[PDB]
Swiss-Prot record:
Description of how the protein assembles with itself and partners: Homodimer. May form a complex composed of RHO, GRK1 and RCVRN in a Ca(2+)-dependent manner; RCVRN prevents the interaction between GRK1 and RHO. Interacts with GRK1. Interacts (phosphorylated form) with SAG. Interacts with GNAT1. Interacts with GNAT3. SAG and G-proteins compete for a common binding site. Interacts with PRCD; the interaction promotes PRCD stability. Forms a complex with ASAP1 and ARF4. Forms a complex with ASAP1, RAB11A, Rabin8/RAB3IP, ARF4 and RAB11FIP3; the complex regulates Golgi-to-cilia rhodopsin/RHO transport in photoreceptors.
Outcome of swapping N2C: Stabilized by a disulfide bond and normal light absorption
Pfam family of the protein (one): Rhodopsin_N
Example of a GO cellular component annotation carried by this entry: rod photoreceptor outer segment
Keywords in alphabetical order: Acetylation, Cell projection, Chromophore, Disulfide bond, G-protein coupled receptor, Glycoprotein, Lipoprotein, Membrane, Metal-binding, Palmitate, Phosphoprotein, Photoreceptor protein, Receptor, Retinal protein, Sensory transduction, Transducer, Transmembrane, Transmembrane helix, Vision, Zinc
Compartments, record wording: Membrane; Cell projection, Cilium, Photoreceptor outer segment
Short motif ('Ionic lock' involved in activated form stabilization): ranges: 134-136
Gene Ontology MF: a single term: zinc ion binding
Post-translational modification note: Phosphorylated on some or all of the serine and threonine residues present in the C-terminal region.
Effect of substituting T94I: Stabilizes the activated conformation and hinders hydrolysis of the covalent bond that retains all-trans-retinol
Keyword Lipoprotein attributed: yes
InterPro entries: GPCR_opsins (IPR050125), GPCR_Rhodpsn (IPR000276), GPCR_Rhodpsn_7TM (IPR017452), Opsin (IPR001760), Retinal_BS (IPR027430), Rhodopsin (IPR000732), Rhodopsin_N (IPR019477)
Protein name (record): Rhodopsin
Length: 326
C-alpha cells in the first residue's frame, strides 16, 4: 500500500513503520523535516500579516470615499471584504495547525480552513466572470441601452455569494466533507476517497466542472470575442480617444487578475485532478503542500493589482495617508 485511509483522515504515508497516526491528535513529525514545518508557518505569518492592511484599508477607502460607488468598485470591494473573512477565519485555523504539526480543533476545525479557502478563490471566481461581463457590455453592446450603476451593481455582487454558497457549504455538511491534505497542516475537499457514505463521486464533478471549467470557458468566450471587438467592430462604433485612455488601462489590469487567478490555481486545481484520478498513488506529503499554500496567497495579490494597476482608484487611498496636503 501507498498511504493510509481512516474514518475522516487520509494520510499519504504507509503505516509501514507504524509511526503514522491520526492528524487530529498527534503532531505529524513522522512525515518530514520540522524546519520545513515551521517554514510553512513562517511563510504563513508573512501571509496573514500582509492580507490585513492591504485588505482593510480597501474597505475603508470605499466607505471614506462617498465618490467611489462605481460598478468597478462594487465588484472590487467584494474582495476586500471576502478576503478579511479568510484572514479572520481560514488563516486563523491553519496557523495553530502549522506551528504544532496537526489540526488541534480537528474534526470541527478542519471544517473552517477548508471552508473559507473554498469561500475565497470561489467567490472571486463568480466575481471574475462579472468582471469579464462588465467589460463586455460597455465594449460590444449586446442590446440597446446597457447602463449598469447601483441596483445593477448589487446584482453581480449578491450573485457571487449565491454561487459560492452553492459549492462551499455542501461539502461541509450533506454532499461531501472537509478533509486534511498534503503535509496535513492544510485542509479542503476530498480527492482520494470514495467514502460512499456522504456521496463524493457526484459532488466532485459538480464541483470541478460547474465551478472551475465552466466559469473559465464562459470567461474565454467573453475574452476571445473582445480582441475581435477592439479591431474591426470598435472603429465603426465611433467612441472617442479621450474615453479609451483609462478604459484602455483598466481592462489591461482587470484581465491580468484573470491570469493571477490561474497562476497558482492551476498548480493546485489541475493537480487536484491528478490526485483525483490516481487515488492510491505514491504521491507523498510534498505533492499537495506547496500548491495548497501558494493557492492561499489568493487574498493578498488581488488588491496589489487593484491598487497598483487601477490608478483610477489609487488616489482615494493616498487621501487617508496625508490627510490635508497640497
Ligand atoms: C498505524 O500504526 C499504529 C501504531 O501505533 C497503530 O496504532 C495501534 O492502535 C491499536 C488499536 O487502536 C492500539 O491498541 C492499544 O489501545 C487499546 C485501547 O483499547 C488497548 O487495547 C491498548 O492500549 C492497546 O495497546 C495500539 O496502541 C497501537 N499500536 C502501537 C504499536 O502502539 C494503528 O494500527 C495504525 N494507525 C493509523 C491508521 O494511523
Ligand atoms: C501503490 O504504489 C505503487 C508503487 O509506485 C504504484 O505502482 C504503479 O503501478 C505499477 C506497479 O505495479 C508501476 O509500473 C507504475 O509505475 C506505478 N504508477 C506510478 C504512479 O508511477 C501504484 O500507484 C500504487 N498502487 C495502486 C495500483 O494504486
Ligand atoms: C484621514 O486620514 C482620516 C481621518 C482622521 C480622523 C478619523 C476620525 C474618526 C472618527 C470616527 C467617528 C465618526 C464615526 C461616526 C460615523 C457616522
Amino acid at each position: 500500500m501507498n498511504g493510509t485511509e481512516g474514518p475522516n483522515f487520509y494520510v499519504p504515508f504507509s503505516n509501514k513503520t507504524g509511526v503514522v497516526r491520526s492528524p487530529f491528535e498527534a503532531p505529524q513529525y513522522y512525515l518530514a523535516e520540522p524546519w520545513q514545518f515551521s517554514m510553512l508557518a513562517a511563510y504563513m505569518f508573512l501571509l496573514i500579516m500582509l492580507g490585513f492592511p492591504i485588505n482593510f484599508l480597501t474597505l475603508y477607502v470605499t466607505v471614506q470615499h462617498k465618490k467611489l460607488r462605481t460598478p468597478l468598485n462594487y465588484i472590487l470591494l467584494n474582495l476586500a471584504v471576502a478576503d478579511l473573512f479568510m484572514v479572520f477565519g481560514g488563516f486563523t485555523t491553519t496557523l495553530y495547525t502549522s506551528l504544532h504539526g496537526y489540526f488541534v480543533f480537528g474534526p470541527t476545525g478542519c471544517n473552517l480552513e477548508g471552508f473559507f479557502a473554498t469561500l475565497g478563490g470561489e467567490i472571486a471566481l463568480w466575481s471574475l466572470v462579472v468582471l469579464a461581463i462588465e467589460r463586455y457590455v460597455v465594449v460590444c453592446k449586446p442590446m440597446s441601452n446597457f447602463r449598469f450603476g447601483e441596483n445593477h451593481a448589487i446584482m453581480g455582487v449578491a450573485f457571487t455569494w449565491v454561487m459560492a454558497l452553492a459549492c462551499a457549504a455542501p461539502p461541509l455538511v450533506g454532499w461531501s466533507r472537509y478533509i486534511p491534505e498534503g503535509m496535513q497542516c492544510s485542509c479542503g475537499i476530498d480527492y482520494y476517497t470514495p467514502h460512499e457514505e456522504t456521496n463524493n463521486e457526484s459532488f466532485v464533478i459538480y464541483m470541478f466542472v460547474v465551478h472551475f471549467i465552466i466559469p473559465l470557458i464562459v470567461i474565454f468566450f467573453c475574452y476571445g470575442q473582445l480582441v475581435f471587438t477592439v479591431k474591426e467592430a470598435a472603429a465603426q462604433q465611433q467612441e472617442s480617444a479621450t474615453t479609451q485612455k483609462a478604459e484602455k488601462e483598466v481592462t489591461r489590469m482587470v484581465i491580468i487578475m484573470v491570469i493571477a487567478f490561474l497562476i497558482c490555481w492551476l498548480p493546485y486545481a489541475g493537480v487536484a485532478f491528478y490526485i483525483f484520478t490516481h487515488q492510491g498513488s505514491d504521491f507523498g506529503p510534498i505533492f499537495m503542500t506547496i500548491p495548497a499554500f501558494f493557492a492561499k496567497t489568493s487574498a493578498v495579490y488581488n488588491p496589489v493589482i487593484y491598487i497598483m494597476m487601477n490608478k483610477q482608484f489609487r488616489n482615494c487611498m493616498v487621501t487617508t495617508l496625508c490627510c490635508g496636503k497640497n
